[PDB]
Enzyme design. Structure first.
Site, PDB file in Angstrom:
ATOM      1  N   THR A 153       1.770   3.836   2.166  1.00  0.00           N
ATOM      2  CA  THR A 153       0.552   3.166   1.664  1.00  0.00           C
ATOM      3  C   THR A 153      -0.395   2.933   2.813  1.00  0.00           C
ATOM      4  O   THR A 153       0.107   2.543   3.865  1.00  0.00           O
ATOM      5  CB  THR A 153       0.940   1.873   0.923  1.00  0.00           C
ATOM      6  OG1 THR A 153       1.857   1.013   1.625  1.00  0.00           O
ATOM      7  CG2 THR A 153       1.557   2.303  -0.435  1.00  0.00           C
ATOM      8  N   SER A 154      -1.698   3.174   2.640  1.00  0.00           N
ATOM      9  CA  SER A 154      -2.689   2.786   3.624  1.00  0.00           C
ATOM     10  C   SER A 154      -3.952   2.701   2.854  1.00  0.00           C
ATOM     11  O   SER A 154      -4.377   3.592   2.069  1.00  0.00           O
ATOM     12  CB  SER A 154      -2.913   3.684   4.880  1.00  0.00           C
ATOM     13  OG  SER A 154      -3.649   2.965   5.884  1.00  0.00           O
TER      14      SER A 154
END
Lengths: 196, 204, 49, 212, 229, 222, 226, 195, 195, 196
Positions: free
Chosen positions: A1-2
């Site tokens: 996730t980013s």
């Protein structure tokens, strides 16, 4: 996730990376994290896929009902629905939610809300597990009220370092642009951002 | 449970003017069961007196351990052992095991014969010199003692002033304890003649 | 140490005799060249030489 | 700690100690392990001091409220089985409880009940509960005859507690004797356990092992 | 179930003759990671009381609202005490204490250390302490977090005992707080340069100097350090 | 993870006399090895010649001061200004303690006052519930230092007339208000040097039929 | 327990408390924490008392062996590197936190060595549980090059901050001042607070006020002709 | 643990050991002895851990008799007692724990006095006028103290010891099927088949 | 303890219970009832977990007496066992487990036929010629299936039980100190004093 | 604790700070973690304070004996040593060393040794616990091939982003310059770069 969001002259651009894992296996690598819970107030989900999703509905339930009785809510207001619900389910659930919106008065604003539930006004926000790598790049190179094209290539270069070093993120980079003009989608493919 | 608290045992000791005194109780339990109302836990190697506390077995084992080493010194150097050298030796013996350690708290009481001076020491479990020239006490009602003795004690006590003080101090402490008492035996150690007196006190 | 009781004169003289015995028996060592007179008292036989 | 009671001809002698410990440190040596359930019931205190003391105050509250309503004094079997239903509730809500309710009424006679912390209720003529109930039993059962006289019986309450006090780590303090009659309990005061020692040492010839 | 997630450290305080000086570090930590900067934690509550709260950001923010709601609650009617004697530090303090008491009953306490310091209408300095243990004690010099065994020693030089308060001016008191902050910045890993100093004076009100840095830094000796061999 | 019981130290000490009673305590507050405050009353008057001190865990020890003085109020109200006695007061404290035992108070509580005869009266509570009258009783972390010395001097435990050698027992001497001031001072002198959680200050409150008087003595700064 | 080690221009000055505790009780109001590796290289120790004193004795013997074997005065490192090696062997089941300081021909030194086998160097270091309270006064007052008289007043007043604020520290303040090419001066009891007050009466008892049970004599004199 | 009691009579030590042996949940045997004569005038009885007891008991008879035949004279009970102590002492430090509680009783014909000793599993020697280990010990220590006298004839020591047996049976939740009795005296080491 | 035994014969059900009650370190009572009447021809003997047993007895007793008074009709032993199985089954699902093993023996006066029910702690009733409970009960089964015949009268069934009682004494490692015998005959529930 | 090394055209320059915590408590704020094991093969220590000092003495010993019999060991040679102690004590020693050094012929080279212990030659290495944050800042703005002046400003700024985000990194910045010319320590106090 980013995920991240970063303000600019006419608003904000919101940015994310669409790889979504369970363990080693990616469940789906095209999965959007950019969520409309109001039509000028968007949000970026991270932490557990379950947990954030449930919260994004109950927060939608309370901004829909805001808009029918009292007019459209401000970005400040939507963040505070997120806050107080994260409060109740701090230990029960986890969330990272960065709340980013366009207001027609104060332009675009970015608030960040960790898992405990607190708000912090900031001009830029990063969250996920992609964000303990890119921290230094974001702060050296930032100046407020930068041109639109400079925002677009900054969020790009930032998220290309996140995908490069964190392996939990990946897929396409997508963005949502909140402006006076409207909501505009961007998408950049892997072959584009590796060069850029 | 704790290894020291499975029979109990206390040793108190105080210095005077031209005299020291050491004193113990006689109880050996195996937890709640009192097994014997007599068992001396002070022993004497020459003109040094060794008090031994803590764990039940280690009173016995560690005593005869010092029996063997005192002997080597007395046989070789052709004199009885001085208070200070024996304090050093106890420190060395306790440390010999630090992994699988002893569990005892010795009290060294004596008066030097080379200069006519009181000398007392104390010890912990792992073993270190604990200097005083006032008082030292050890055991498991050592806590209760530390206070009792402080209130009562006065610098420079006379030989049979020193006897009433240590006898009362011990009596009151031991009957505020479960695992020590059942009789007490007080030594008055002078420079020429050490007197052994058992003390009539609460059994119950 | 082990019996908590004073050693007989018999035991102690024999223990030494066996040490000396070890040197003649094996090892290619020379024997220790000492001759002992032991004076002892023990319970059992009284004075012993 | 030891609380014992034995029925005899005259009523019941209850005899109890007064040392209540906390840790290896001795807290107090003057504690009363008799609880007046009313003037015609005596409750022992053994097991946890807090638990046992409290609920038997309130048992005295219900004793006066059996007593008004029936216009008749509470029976020994009714009190006991009140107290029993209460402690079954908190059976594994982590509480303790070892009492002998000891009473004598005119239409039921002397009757001991031994109410437990599990809600077990056992009748019987002798019970002993405590950390010195093994030391107590032996001496108490040797010196037992059911037909006995009051003087002799009074002496037995002392002698068993004494034995218990001598070897047990937490027994001692002072002893107390009560003699329950039908008319009520009459209190017989406080004897120190260590001054008691020297008396019976002379008189019997006991405690050979104690030096002196 | 309560565990600190985002943490703050160090608020220090002392008395002087006409008032108190309360000052605190500024830093939203996440352990090692300093994730939030410029975090205000001298919360002005009234204007004759500053409440400085420390610990979890989340727990403080959520009792920050109850503080503001308290001032509203007092202000209801009362025309000679709606802003004229509605508030003393002491009143505010009791309330904080037993709310935390009741949350420790639940055993999800509000995770904070709280100093309440101001000056009353008697001209009396006030300075008391509450925490997630819920111990309540008054003290003439006080500190919290990592300063509660660092900054406390320093300040006890000024304030040996209870008779040294009337000697101690507002010029000496500035100096002590400054020195304490330096030292906290060196030896604490949670500390930072930015701190805020409030003086609650009774004759000049809530004087809030904002955005102080630490001064006269010593780092000259550090080039003289060599190998271990 | 949360654990709501620490220790805040301190030491308390109750002595019953013949027309007086003394409830003292220290005014040191600590948490571990850092000194919070040198000055902090723990021995509060509560009206009607009852002085209370709840020593141990400070917060708990303030909790039962709260409710006790609340009961002072409601008793006088619904009995129309009835003076609450030592006997009566004791039994109220015990109800508050016991009713929380699945989150208990973790303090050692003591009250002291006079009784109706005009003699001292001291009762002492254990943590959970129950209590018993005493004549000397310390509590706190330095309890086991002050207690055997005070039975050696109040009740003269295991002492004898001199020159008889255990034939005669030493008779119990009367207790003056002046004399029991000295014992508290001497005791708390011994406490300080040998125990690290008593210090700064000693506060004796002496309670009589005449009134409550406070008397402050310094101890050592460490 | 506050034990400071403060360098100044002409040597190093090391100060200590003398209150040695064992849990909530004060065992002894008078022992010393200062040991002697060597005559001009003093050290003090903190943490588990047994494991300080024995480690200082053990390695003390070996640097004195060496110092004869080179026929030269010992150096600070010599002691310091032997220490380091030894504590590491058990992997920090030994709990020592010693300040090692000293002078020698090749200048002033001051190290600190933790229980695993870590080592740091500064110009002001402190160990102990009170260490924190020392450190606060040390960082403000200190400055580069001190004189001897200034250095002993900084040292002493740093332990006193310790005394007042740290329960486990108290008693006398010892000093041992080590200065290059002059002997090392031990100033025991430099400044002594924490004087015990006179008792309100004495507690002397007359004879026979404790019971006796029986009498015998124990004979500690050697065996002789009868 | 089971029955194992001593009483020091004027001239003899009377030891008694349990018949019952339960290993698992079924009594398997019920006439077994738990005692082995060390020397003509010292008997040793043992109880403690299963299987540790049988081996370690054979071990002491072996070693003490080894020394007996070396010197054509027998060790005093004080001297044998110390040997048993020595060994068990090394054994709580050592890798495998032994756990053997022993009453060593003997008649020393050179001190002319019966001697009774109690060595617990930890390694503590104590001279006593009556003794016991374990579960049985808790009821009897107080029962024997009551009735004792300093000097009691041999058949008085038997009668007392049968009061202690009789008592035990009521009170213990365990079943032990009566004891075996042995007298160790100055006239040798015999058994009494009367229980 | 944990011994309750049943042998049904062709005119009678024989239920026997342990005398001893052992709580804590000692046997407190060595003589004590451990069974109560439910009905005039329905007897429940019970053993198991302390402090459930007293309570689960008097709760059953209150209910069955409530029925038998209410409607003027004594329940079938068939009915009674079911009722008891309902509570036992319910308490495994509920917060407070009841650990008690219960043998209910009755004489049905509607069939005129003895019936014996075995109900384990969990709650499964099963009618049997004979049944037992506990680890003690194990030992009795193998003599029961040897010597039993189902033509048996009062006396023959008595003599079989006696072996079972004797067996228990040799083979069991813990006392129970005899038994109370109670017989559900055709003229009530009679206590007989034979051991 | 942040440690880096960056190679340049005429050598390698090594960079470390001086803040070393245990807990929240800064032990010494002027700590030196750039260590000599030879005379042109210098190391940077990060990891467990005991285990780096221990290992690093043992390498100092092997290398100096290598000099005395065989001639000077290479960077390659020294790097292998540190691997061969980590690998055989990987079960209980937590140590990540950067071995940077100047060979005559090959100029400056960097090897980094993980906790599990293994050679990796790199154009630059970062490891520590506050150098996780600057993976993106070093990577993007790293120019392969720099000059002596360019290199020191690059590493100064890299260490400043690392300091800003890690409370275990602060204090003065220590640098060692290894070039044929010799060995030069440089030091930057905080006022000198917190302005930039």
């Amino acid at each position: 996730t980013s995920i991240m969001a970063v303000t600019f002259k006419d608003g904000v651009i919101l940015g994310a990376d669409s790889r979504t894992t369970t363990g080693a296996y990616i469940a789906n690598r095209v999965t959007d994290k950019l969520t409309r819970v109001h039509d000028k107030i968007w949000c970026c989900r991270s932490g557990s896929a379950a947990d954030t999703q449930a919260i994004a509905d109950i927060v939608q339930y309370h901004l829909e009902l805001y808009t029918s009785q009292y007019g459209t809510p401000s970005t400040e207001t939507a963040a505070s629905v997120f806050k107080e619900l994260c409060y109740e389910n701090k230990d029960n659930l986890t969330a990272g939610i960065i709340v980013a919106g366009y207001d027609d008065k104060n332009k675009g604003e970015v608030y960040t809300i960790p898992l405990g539930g607190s708000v912090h006004k900031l001009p830029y926000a990063i969250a996920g597990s992609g964000s303990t790598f890119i921290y230094g790049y974001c702060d050296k190179n930032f100046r407020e009220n930068m041109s639109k094209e400079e925002t677009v290539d900054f969020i790009k270069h930032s998220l290309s370092q996140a995908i490069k070093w964190d392996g939990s993120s990946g897929g396409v980079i997508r963005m949502v642009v909140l402006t006076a003009a409207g909501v505009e989608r961007l998408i950049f493919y892997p072959d584009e951002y590796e060069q850029l | 449970s704790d290894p020291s608290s499975i029979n109990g045992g206390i040793v108190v000791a105080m210095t005077g003017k031209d005299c020291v005194a050491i004193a113990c109780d006689l109880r050996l339990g195996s937890q709640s069961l009192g097994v014997s109302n007599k068992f001396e836990k002070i022993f004497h190697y020459g003109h040094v007196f060794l008090g031994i506390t803590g764990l039940a077995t280690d009173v016995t084992t560690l005593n005869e351990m010092f029996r063997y080493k005192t002997n080597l010194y007395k046989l070789k150097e052709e004199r009885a052992i001085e208070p200070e050298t024996f304090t050093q030796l106890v420190s060395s013996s306790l440390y010999e095991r630090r992994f699988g350690p002893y569990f005892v708290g010795p009290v060294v009481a004596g008066i030097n014969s080379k200069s006519g001076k009181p000398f007392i020491a104390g010890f912990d479990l792992i073993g270190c010199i604990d200097e005083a020239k006032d008082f030292i006490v050890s055991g498991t009602a050592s806590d209760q003692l530390f206070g009792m003795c402080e209130s009562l004690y006065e610098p420079n006590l006379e030989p049979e002033d020193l006897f009433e003080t240590i006898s009362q101090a011990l009596l009151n402490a031991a009957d505020r304890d479960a695992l020590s008492g059942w009789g007490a035996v007080v030594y008055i150690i002078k420079k020429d003649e050490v007197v052994k007196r058992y003390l009539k006190m609460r059994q119950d | 140490k082990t019996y908590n009781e004073d050693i007989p004169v018999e035991i102690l003289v024999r223990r030494l005799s066996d040490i000396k015995q070890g040197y003649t028996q094996h090892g290619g060592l020379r024997p220790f060249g000492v001759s002992f007179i032991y004076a002892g008292y023990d319970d059992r036989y009284g004075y012993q030489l | 700690t030891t609380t014992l009671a034995f029925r005899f001809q005259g009523g019941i002698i209850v005899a109890v100690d007064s040392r209540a410990t906390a840790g290896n440190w001795v807290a107090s040596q003057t504690v009363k392990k008799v609880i007046e359930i009313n003037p015609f019931l005596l409750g022992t205190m053994a097991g946890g001091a807090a638990d046992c003391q409290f609920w038997e105050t309130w048992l005295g509250s219900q004793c006066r409220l059996h007593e008004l309503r029936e216009k008749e004094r509470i029976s020994v079997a009714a009190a006991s089985k009140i107290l029993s239903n209460l402690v079954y509730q908190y059976k594994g809500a982590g509480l303790s409880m070892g009492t002998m309710i000891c009473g004598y009424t005119r239409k039921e006679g002397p009757t001991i009940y031994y109410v437990d912390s599990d809600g077990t209720r056992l009748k019987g003529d002798i019970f002993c509960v405590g950390s010195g109930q093994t030391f107590a039993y032996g001496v108490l059962d040797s010196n037992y005859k059911w037909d006995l006289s009051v003087e002799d019986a009074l002496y037995l309450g002392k002698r068993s507690i004494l034995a218990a006090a001598h070897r047990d780590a937490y027994s001692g303090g002072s002893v107390n004797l009560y003699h329950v009659t039908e008319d009520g309990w009459i209190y017989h005061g406080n004897h120190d356990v260590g001054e008691l020692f020297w008396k019976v040492k002379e008189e019997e010839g006991s405690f050979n092992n104690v030096i002196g | 179930t309560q565990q600190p997630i985002v943490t703050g450290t160090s608020v220090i305080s002392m008395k002087y003759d006409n008032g108190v000086i309360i000052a605190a570090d500024n830093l939203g930590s996440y352990g090692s990671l300093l994730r939030f900067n410029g975090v205000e934690r001298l919360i002005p509550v009234g204007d004759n009381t500053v409440v400085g709260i420390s610990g979890d950001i989340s727990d403080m923010q959520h009792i920050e609202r109850l503080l503001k709601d308290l001032v509203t609650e007092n202000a209801y009617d009362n025309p000679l005490a709606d802003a004229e004697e509605a508030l003393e530090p002491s009143y505010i303090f009791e309330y904080l204490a037993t709310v935390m008491y009741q949350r420790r009953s639940k055993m999800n306490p509000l995770w904070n250390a709280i100093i309440v310091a101001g000056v009353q209408s008697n001209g009396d300095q006030f300075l008391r302490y509450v925490n997630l243990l819920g111990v309540t004690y008054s003290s003439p010099t006080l500190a919290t977090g990592f300063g509660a065994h660092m900054a406390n020693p320093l300040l006890r030089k000024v304030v040996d005992r209870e008779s040294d308060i009337p000697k101690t001016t507002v010029q000496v008191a500035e100096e002590a707080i400054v020195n304490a902050m330096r030292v906290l910045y060196y030896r604490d890993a949670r500390s930072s340069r930015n701190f805020s100093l409030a003086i609650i004076d009774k004759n000049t009100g809530l004087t809030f100097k904002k955005n102080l840095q630490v001064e006269n830094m010593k780092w000259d000796f550090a080039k003289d350090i060599k190998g271990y061999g | 993870q949360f654990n709501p019981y620490g220790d805040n130290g301190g030491t308390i000490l109750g002595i019953a006399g013949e027309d007086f009673a003394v409830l003292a305590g220290d005014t040191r507050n600590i948490t571990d090895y850092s000194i919070n405050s040198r000055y902090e009353p723990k021995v509060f008057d509560c009206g009607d010649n009852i002085v209370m001190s709840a020593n141990g865990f400070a917060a708990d020890g303030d909790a039962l001061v709260k409710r006790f003085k609340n009961s002072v109020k409601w008793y006088h109200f619904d009995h129309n200004d009835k003076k609450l006695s030592i006997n009566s007061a004791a039994r109220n404290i015990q109800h508050l303690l016991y009713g929380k035992r699945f989150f208990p108070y973790y303090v050692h509580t003591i009250i002291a006052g006079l009784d109706e005869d005009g003699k001292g009266a001291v009762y002492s509570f254990d943590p959970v519930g129950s209590y018993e009258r005493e004549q000397c009783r310390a509590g706190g972390a330095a309890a086991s230092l002050i207690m055997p010395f005070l039975d050696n001097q109040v009740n003269f435990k295991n002492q004898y007339e001199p020159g008889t050698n255990g034939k005669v027992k030493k008779p119990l001497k009367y207790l003056s208000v002046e004399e029991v001031i000295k014992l508290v001072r001497d005791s708390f002198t011994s406490a300080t040097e040998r125990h690290i959680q008593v210090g700064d200050g000693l506060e004796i409150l002496i309670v009589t039929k005449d009134g409550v008087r406070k008397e402050f003595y310094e101890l050592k700064r460490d | 327990t506050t034990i400071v080690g403060v360098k100044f221009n002409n040597g190093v000055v090391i100060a200590a408390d003398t209150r040695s505790t064992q849990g909530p009780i004060v065992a002894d109001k008078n022992c010393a924490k200062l040991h002697r590796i060597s005559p001009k290289i003093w050290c003090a120790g903190a943490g588990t008392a047994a494991d300080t004193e024995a480690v200082t004795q053990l390695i003390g013997s070996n640097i004195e062996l060496h110092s004869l074997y080179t026929s030269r005065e010992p150096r600070v490192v010599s002691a310091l590197q032997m220490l380091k090696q030894h504590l590491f062997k058990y992997q920090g089941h030994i709990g020592a936190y010693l300040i090692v300081a000293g002078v020698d021909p090749t200048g002033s030194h001051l190290f600190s060595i933790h229980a695993h086998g870590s080592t740091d160097v500064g110009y002001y270091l402190s160990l102990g549980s009170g260490s924190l309270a020392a450190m606060a006064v040390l960082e403000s007052h200190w400055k580069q090059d001190l004189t001897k008289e200034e250095a002993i007043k900084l040292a002493s007043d740093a332990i006193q901050a310790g005394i007042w604020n740290d329960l486990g520290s108290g008693s006398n303040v010892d000093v041992c001042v080590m200065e290059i090419g002059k002997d090392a001066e031990y100033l025991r009891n430099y400044l002594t607070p924490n004087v015990r007050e006179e008792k309100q009466k004495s507690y002397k008892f007359p004879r026979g006020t404790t019971a006796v049970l029986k009498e015998s004599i124990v004979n500690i004199c050697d065996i002789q002709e009868e | 643990m089971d029955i194992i009691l001593g009483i020091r009579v004027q001239d003899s030590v009377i030891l008694a050991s349990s018949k019952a042996v339960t290993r698992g949940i079924s009594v398997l045997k019920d006439s077994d002895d738990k005692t082995r004569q060390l020397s003509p005038h010292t008997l040793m009885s043992f109880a403690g851990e299963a299987g540790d007891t049988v081996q370690f008991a054979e071990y002491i008879q072996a070693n003490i008799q080894l020394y007996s035949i070396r010197e054509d004279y027998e060790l005093s009970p004080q001297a044998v007692s110390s040997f048993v102590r020595q060994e068990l002492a090394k054994s709580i430090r050592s890798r495998r724990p032994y756990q053997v509680n022993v009453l060593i009783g003997g008649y020393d014909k050179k001190k002319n006095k019966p001697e009774l000793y109690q060595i617990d599993y930890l390694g503590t020697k104590v001279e006593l006028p009556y003794g016991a280990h374990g579960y049985s010990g808790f009821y009897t220590f107080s029962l024997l103290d009551h009735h004792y006298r300093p000097d009691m004839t041999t058949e008085e020591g038997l009668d007392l010891l049968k009061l202690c047996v009789q008592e035990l049976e009521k009170r213990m939740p365990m079943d032990f099927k009566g004891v075996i009795v042995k007298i160790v005296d100055k006239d040798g080491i015999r058994q009494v088949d009367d229980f």
